[PDB]
């Protein structure tokens, strides 16, 4: 009945975050649209917005990697783009020392909140480092909205 | 028309967690009030409660820091205080910068759940170490409720 979406990362899309709804246990209904990898708000109102991303790497590089994940709003009325929800994670404090085992690491990031949105607004679930994204298994990376 | 809240950390308040609603993409409506930095429940019912906090530091100190974040309920009927949702993070698993100079770390904490609350109940988003909080950018630290 109410505008819903629960889009999942496309496992077919190599090294990039592409949202997909044409899958089992995924939603896009009651006006919610997926245009240019963004969720389009069908009507004015309160929406619960959420997203999860899972990062994976093998060992630690010389560069101090900072993994970020945000849900941004493009408000069509003002033609403005802002970050509604954002989180940062540092997976590596120290680089793997001299011929050591490049042990796999995993970092989940969850974002969620209630926001008053306007009809036509575009929400994006963005990551600065998509090459660190893990969509090997279902349920690890998703982005959704629900009108309340 | 349902009781709502999505308060955000005041960037003007230095080294402390002060909730604010008088901002864009922030909510406080339909009975929900923000007094003495807490959210007061306006009516009996089920509420989705959520909060996010982002902790940041520049290297690791001598003390073993444990960062905690909880949503507590003061139930006015019984004059009792309990932790509804809680999470703990250890940012520095020893890894003290000995020799060279510090690199920034980031730790996000998300809490969310559905609870039956009573009118007049006071909800607090509490952190043991507010000095580690990061509100440099919008969407990093928030606290909210919505009646279902």
């Amino acid at each position, epitope marked *: 009945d109410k505008p819903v979406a629960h889009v999942v990362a496309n496992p077919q899309a190599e090294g990039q975050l592409q949202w997909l709804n044409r899958r089992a246990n995924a939603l896009l209904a009651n006006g919610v649209e997926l245009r240019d990898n963004q969720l389009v708000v069908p009507s004015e109102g309160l929406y619960l917005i959420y997203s999860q991303v899972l990062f994976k790497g093998q060992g630690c590089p010389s*560069t*101090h990697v900072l993994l*970020t994940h945000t849900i941004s709003r493009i408000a069509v009325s003002y033609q403005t*783009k802002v*970050n509604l929800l954002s989180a940062i994670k540092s997976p590596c404090q120290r680089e793997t020392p001299e011929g050591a085992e490049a042990k796999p690491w995993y970092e989940p990031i969850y974002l969620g909140g209630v926001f008053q949105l306007e009809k036509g607004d575009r929400l994006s679930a963005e990551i*600065n480092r998509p090459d660190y994204l893990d969509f090997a298994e279902s349920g690890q990376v998703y982005f959704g909205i629900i009108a309340l | 028309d349902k009781p709502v809240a999505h308060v955000v950390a005041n960037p003007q308040a230095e080294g402390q967690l002060q909730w604010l609603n008088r901002r864009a993409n922030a909510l406080l409506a339909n009975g929900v009030e923000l007094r003495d930095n807490q959210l007061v429940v306006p009516s009996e019912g089920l509420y989705l409660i959520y909060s996010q906090v982002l902790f940041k530091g520049q290297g690791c100190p001598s003390t073993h820091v444990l960062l905690t974040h909880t949503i507590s309920r003061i139930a006015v009927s019984y004059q009792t205080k309990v932790n509804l949702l809680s999470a703990i993070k250890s940012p520095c698993q020893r890894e003290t910068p000995e020799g060279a100079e510090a690199k920034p770390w980031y730790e996000p904490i998300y809490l969310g759940g559905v609870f039956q609350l009573e009118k007049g109940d006071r909800l607090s988003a509490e952190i043991n170490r507010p000095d580690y909080l990061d509100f*440099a*950018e*919008s969407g990093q630290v928030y606290f909210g409720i919505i009646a279902l």
Partner: nanobody
Amino acid sequence: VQLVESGGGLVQAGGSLSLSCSASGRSLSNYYMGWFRQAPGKERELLGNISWRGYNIYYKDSVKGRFTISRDDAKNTIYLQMNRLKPEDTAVYYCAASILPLSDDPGWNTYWGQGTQVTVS
């Protein structure tokens, strides 16, 4: 993170212009890099951004189809190709970088260039 713009100046209306921005610092692959502009007496606006290896691209609706943003990760340089310039494009153009997507409400975790003037007509 330090940002230095180049290009700009004057162009006749309907003309073209290209701006560059060179970044210096540690792990620049973590940053979204982009462009803002601010016209005299008008509010500062985000034009767009590009993250490492061009995985995220954003264009403000008003410049979509005429402005192109590109990134050279070997040179740590971003470019703003501006076509069919109109008098309303007269502003100071600023290069910006942030580990979070750039926003029309920038915070203390966004780095800025010195700004470059572009005058159209």
